[PDB]
């Protein structure tokens, strides 16, 4: 399914009709609405890390 | 001594026994390579300059 619909909030409906269960079971799932910049930092290995060669 | 002995680089040590010295004896030595030598042959080498600790 499209990624946008999950982001748009559409609750994709999954129906489960088990052999023993007489009543079908409905499951609807979407992205919960509710965004900050994860500024990445990459730390090089220390000399002591490199000291073991 | 013969200049050949000096040119060989043989070390000559002079001792002085006198009261004023701490243990009453001091010695100094000289060879071809340290008595006002013409040449200073140095091979100064440094490794692991950073050496953090
Ligand atoms: C001068 O130094 C270089 C390298 O340190 C060495 O290869 C050379 O033999 C030296 N020359 C003399 C005359 O000591
Ligand atoms: C001078 O130093 C170099 C480097 O340590 C060495 O290869 C050479 O034999 C030395 N020569 C003398 C005359 O001490």
Swiss-Prot record, chain A:
N-glycosylated; important for IgM secretion and its localization at the plasma membrane. The interaction with FCMR is glycan-independent. It comes from the Eukaryota. The basic structural unit of both sIgM and mIgM molecules consists of two identical heavy chains and two identical light chains; disulfide-linked. N-terminal variable regions of the heavy and light chains form the antigen binding sites, whereas the C-terminal constant regions of the heavy chains interact with immune receptors to mediate effector functions. Constant region of immunoglobulin heavy chains. Immunoglobulins, also known as antibodies, are membrane-bound or secreted glycoproteins produced by B lymphocytes. In the recognition phase of humoral immunity, the membrane-bound immunoglobulins serve as receptors which, upon binding of a specific antigen, trigger the clonal expansion and differentiation of B lymphocytes into immunoglobulins-secreting plasma cells. Secreted immunoglobulins mediate the effector phase of humoral immunity, which results in the elimination of bound antigens. It is linked to Agammaglobulinemia 1, autosomal recessive: A primary immunodeficiency characterized by profoundly low or absent serum antibodies and low or absent circulating B cells due to an early block of B-cell development. Affected individuals develop severe infections in the first years of life. This is Immunoglobulin heavy constant mu. The gene is IGHM. The chain holds residues 290 to 344 of 474 of the full protein.
From Swiss-Prot, chain B:
Signal peptide: none annotated. N-glycosylated; important for IgM secretion and its localization at the plasma membrane. The interaction with FCMR is glycan-independent. Changing residue 19 to D: In IMGT allele IGHM*02. The basic structural unit of both sIgM and mIgM molecules consists of two identical heavy chains and two identical light chains; disulfide-linked. N-terminal variable regions of the heavy and light chains form the antigen binding sites, whereas the C-terminal constant regions of the heavy chains interact with immune receptors to mediate effector functions. Constant region of immunoglobulin heavy chains. Immunoglobulins, also known as antibodies, are membrane-bound or secreted glycoproteins produced by B lymphocytes. In the recognition phase of humoral immunity, the membrane-bound immunoglobulins serve as receptors which, upon binding of a specific antigen, trigger the clonal expansion and differentiation of B lymphocytes into immunoglobulins-secreting plasma cells. Secreted immunoglobulins mediate the effector phase of humoral immunity, which results in the elimination of bound antigens. It is linked to Agammaglobulinemia 1, autosomal recessive: A primary immunodeficiency characterized by profoundly low or absent serum antibodies and low or absent circulating B cells due to an early block of B-cell development. Affected individuals develop severe infections in the first years of life. This is Immunoglobulin heavy constant mu. It comes from Homo sapiens.
């Amino acid at each position: 399914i499209c990624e946008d619909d999950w982001n748009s909030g559409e609750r994709f409906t999954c129906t489960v009709t088990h052999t023993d269960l007489p009543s079908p079971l409905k499951q609807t799932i979407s992205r919960p609405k509710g965004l900050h910049r994860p500024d990445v930092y990459l730390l090089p290995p220390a000399r002591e890390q490199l000291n073991l060669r | 001594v013969s200049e050949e002995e000096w040119n060989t680089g043989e070390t000559y040590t002079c001792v002085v026994a006198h009261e004023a010295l701490p243990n009453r004896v001091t010695e100094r030595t000289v060879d071809k390579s340290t008595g006002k030598p013409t040449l200073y042959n140095v091979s100064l080498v440094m490794s692991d300059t950073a050496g953090t600790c």
